[PDB]
């Protein structure tokens, strides 16, 4: 069938598999893994069933306007839509200042789209109200990397998986969430049976079936668990003083300078016999995990939402880094502290791109007066155009919309009416009778469209070209494989036309296409520790991704950051083999963060922990994977997981309709009684739009990253 294969990237998870899209007579007919990208030709079942999604007729294909709140969506021309969008936004700024408008985007947006949007808002409008769904996700890992190393993003790559001799896998259901990486992990243990795997997660998932040890600790007690591991490492003389004496600093519980002796004193509060009882685990798991971690030749940690979606998320990230820093299990092949990124482009588009409320592109910060001046110079802005104040972070943004402080919002390639925490609160904010909400959305069944005043039809996935930056610092091009249907337009172009019409200086949006923007972005990264100047559109066309830092066309890219001879940001003649250059003295920092718990812990009235999780067949809100019949055959609808020994004790059996109730709402769900959830925990998925589980969850956030605690709240269950 296919006459040609078009190279791109899988639409789904931050594993970032390359994809070849097979096309015949302008239509996509087949898909295979890119043999030259890291996945080496392999896709999971989601990746492999992308053609039905791309070919679906169930698409937003024309602009729609709701003339009045509560009205119905009706057809409207592109020009009328762009004029309406431009005049409302312009008028808002004219009347109330830039802070009355906001961008709410996505880690699924092309890097180029998020770049243009971020520039329009911060540089054109003069507001820093640019945030996005990675606030819900990766913000705690950013905080953890910036506080430990002074720079965002992993220092290792997926390649370290192939030399790791121990895996510490915490708050990650890698099997269901990163299937191609899970297979690479399983394969490593297959090829070297000596490889040790620790899986640390209150639920027993498919990820545990390759583990030497499954640590089913009590929700929120993992900080005490990880401090206790460090206590064992030091107590049994398994630390690395040649490393930490030269390359580490110590900060105490107050965030003040300290030392190794201070660290040991602090760790006395986390002895294994005490912590085992806090965590509800056998004491031998603490010793066993610590010893596996520190005795192994090369140890790699991997983690995702169970660690990040936490009011102690930044701190929990810090503790993982602590373990690597005290042992020097870092900056060597196989040995690294690796945050897993959930979305295909949270890394490239939002974090690296600085498309969050407090950031500027390529490692710059809003509160830094010098970073503002650098961006005004790079972007051709008048002096002081960039507001000194961070804009609203996602949770505060929707609160601001609720108050009427934010009057005009663009929502793009994300579905916040389904996925924000505390939905009953959120749905009210999104119903402000004087709000103007514009949605750029590919599928009509996204529940957010029920709040939209204006809906614009986007080009989907490989209907246009653009870069995705996955979890390992790999930036990969998707070339255009097919035309968009109907009146669908590339969002890069829509954003440019919107800005022009809203009175933005045309010098600020001088872009015909995504390649034009990519070239300006390259220049804005030049000289920074992100420098990807060497990633020309032409190299990205021929390559299956390049890994930053990559400062010139003759540069291969970078696998080991902070390492002399590997990282071009480390001077060739630096006195030391390693250089944590994001800190002013080149040293990484161990943080003695106190272990606490969730914002909403169980009590007499709500005695269970409630968590939320993923499932392999379904992608987030299922507006895409929902179009694939094969993906509906195992878990067609939501359920609640309940512990066996909990349920029997409370007269609940498998299949029973149960009421799950928090302080915020109550929902009926079929009971899925087993040993997956440890005792005292229940668990709901969020893929089902008929069961908006975020109505049950609380909005409490990490006070630094502002990531919501989706992983923990308090609940009760009773038979319906
Ligand atoms: N199939 C599929 N894959 C995906 C996605 C999808 O929608 N579908 N989405 C992608 C995105 S954007 C992301 S963020 C990743 C998410 O990937 P994961 O975070 O790996 O998946 P979750 O099920 O949300 O992960 C939560 C795991 O953390 C656990 N957890 C709960 N409480 C705690 C705690 O107190 N401590 C610890 N340490 N763990 C806890 C839960 O038991 C759960 O099994 O998946 C990505 N991959
Ligand atoms: N309870 C609970 N809630 C959670 C989580 C959890 O673990 N538990 N996880 C959180 C995390 S980590 C994340 S990443 C978020 C993700 O949450 P969302 O981002 O809200 O979920 P998605 O379904 O990925 O949203 C992508 C949207 O883009 C649309 N779309 C697809 N292609 C295109 C395109 O080209 N253009 C446009 N405009 N739209 C397109 C899809 O139809 C869909 O509505 O959810 C968060 N919510
Ligand atoms: S592991 Fe992730 S990126 Fe790879 S094919 Fe599966 S969904 Fe796509
Ligand atoms: Mo995510």
Swiss-Prot record:
Protein EC: 1.9.6.1
CC cofactor note: Binds 1 [4Fe-4S] cluster. Binds 1 molybdenum-bis(molybdopterin guanine dinucleotide) (Mo-bis-MGD) cofactor per subunit.
Record's comment on post-translational modification: Predicted to be exported by the Tat system. The position of the signal peptide cleavage has been experimentally proven.
Domain 4Fe-4S Mo/W bis-MGD-type: 3-58
Coiled-coil residues: none
UniProt note: pH dependence: Optimum pH is between 8 and 9.5.
Purpose: Catalytic subunit of the periplasmic nitrate reductase complex NapAB. Receives electrons from NapB and catalyzes the reduction of nitrate to nitrite.
Protein name: Periplasmic nitrate reductase
Gene that this sequence comes from: napA
């Amino acid at each position: 069938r296919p006459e040609k294969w078009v190279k791109g990237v899988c639409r789904y998870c931050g594993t970032g598999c390359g994809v070849l899209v097979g096309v015949k007579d302008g239509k996509a007919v087949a898909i295979q893994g890119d043999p030259n990208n890291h996945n080496a030709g392999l896709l999971c079942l989601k990746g492999s069933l992308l053609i039905p999604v791309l070919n679906s007729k169930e698409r937003v294909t024309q602009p729609l306007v709701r003339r009045h709140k509560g009205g119905k969506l009706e057809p409207v021309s592109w020009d009328e839509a762009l004029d309406l969008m431009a005049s409302r936004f312009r008028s808002s700024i004219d009347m109330y200042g830039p802070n009355s408008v906001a961008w709410y985007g996505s880690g699924q947006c092309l890097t180029e789209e998020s770049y243009v949007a971020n520039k329009i808002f911060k540089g054109g409008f003069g507001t820093n109200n640019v945030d996005g769904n990675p606030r819900l996700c990766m913000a705690s890992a950013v905080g953890g990397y910036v506080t430990s190393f002074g720079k965002d993003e992993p220092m290792g790559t997926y390649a370290d998986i192939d030399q790791a001799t121990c895996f510490f896998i915490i708050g990650s259901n890698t099997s269901e969430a990163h299937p191609v990486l899970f297979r690479r992990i399983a394969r490593r243990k297959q090829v070297e049976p000596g490889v040790k795997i620790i899986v640390a997660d209150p639920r027993r998932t498919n990820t545990s079936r390759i583990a030497d040890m499954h640590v089913a600790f009590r929700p929120g007690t993992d900080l005490a668990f990880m401090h206790s591991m460090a206590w064992v490492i030091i107590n049994e003389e398994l630390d690395n003083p040649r490393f930490w004496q030269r390359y580490v600093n110590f900060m105490d519980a107050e965030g003040k300078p300290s030392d190794f002796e201070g660290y040991k004193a602090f760790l006395e509060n986390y002895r294994p016999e005490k912590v085992a009882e806090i965590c509800r685990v056998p004491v031998e798991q603490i010793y066993g995990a610590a010893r596996a971690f520190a005795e192994s030749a090369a140890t790699m940690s991997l983690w995702c939402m169970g660690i990040n979606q936490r009011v102690q998320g930044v701190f929990a990230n810090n503790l993982i880094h602590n373990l690597h820093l005290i042992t020097g299990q870092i900056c060597r092949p196989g040995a690294t502290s690796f945050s897993l990124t959930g979305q295909p482009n949270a890394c490239g588009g939002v974090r690296d791109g600085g498309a969050l409320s407090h950031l500027l592109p390529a490692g710059r910060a809003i509160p830094n007066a010098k970073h503002r001046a650098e961006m005004e110079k790079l972007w051709g802005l008048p002096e002081g155009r960039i507001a000194p104040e961070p804009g609203y972070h996602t949770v505060a943004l929707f609160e601001a919309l609720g108050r009427g402080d934010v009057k005009c919002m663009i929502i793009c390639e994300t579905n916040p009416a389904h996925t924000l925490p505390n939905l009953n609160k959120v749905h009210k904010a999104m119903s402000h009778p004087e709000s103007f909400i514009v949605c750029i959305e590919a599928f009509p069944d996204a529940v957010t469209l029920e709040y939209a005043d204006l809906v614009l039809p986007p080009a989907f996935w490989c209907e246009r070209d653009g870069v995705y930056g996955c979890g390992e610092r790999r930036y990969s091009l998707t070339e255009k494989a097919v035309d968009p249907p109907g009146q669908c337009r590339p969002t890069v172009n829509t954003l440019v036309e919107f800005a022009r019409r809203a009175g933005v200086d045309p010098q600020l949006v001088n872009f015909r296409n995504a390649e034009d923007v990519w070239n300006e972005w390259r220049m804005v990264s030049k000289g920074t520790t992100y420098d990807f100047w060497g990633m020309t559109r032409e190299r990205l066309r021929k390559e299956s991704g390049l890994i930053w830092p990559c400062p010139s066309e003759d540069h291969p890219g970078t696998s080991l950051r902070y390492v002399r001879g590997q990282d071009p940001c480390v001077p060739a003649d630096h006195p030391d083999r390693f250089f944590f250059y994001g800190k002013p003295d080149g040293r990484a920092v161990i943080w003695m963060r106190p272990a606490k718990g969730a914002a909403e812990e169980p009590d007499a009235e709500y005695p269970l922990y409630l968590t939320s999780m993923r499932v392999i067949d379904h992608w987030h809100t299922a507006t895409m994977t929902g179009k694939v019949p094969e993906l509906q055959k195992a878990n067609p609808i939501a359920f609640v997981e309940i512990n066996e020994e909990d349920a029997a004790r409370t007269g609940i059996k498998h299949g029973d309709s149960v009421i799950v109730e928090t302080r915020r709402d109550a929902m009926e769900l079929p009971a899925r009684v087993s040993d997956v959830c440890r005792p005292g925990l229940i668990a709901v998925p969020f893929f089902d739009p008929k069961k908006l589980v975020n109505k049950l969850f609380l909005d409490a956030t990490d006070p630094v990253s502002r990531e919501p605690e989706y992983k923990i709240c308090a609940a009760r269950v009773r038979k319906a």
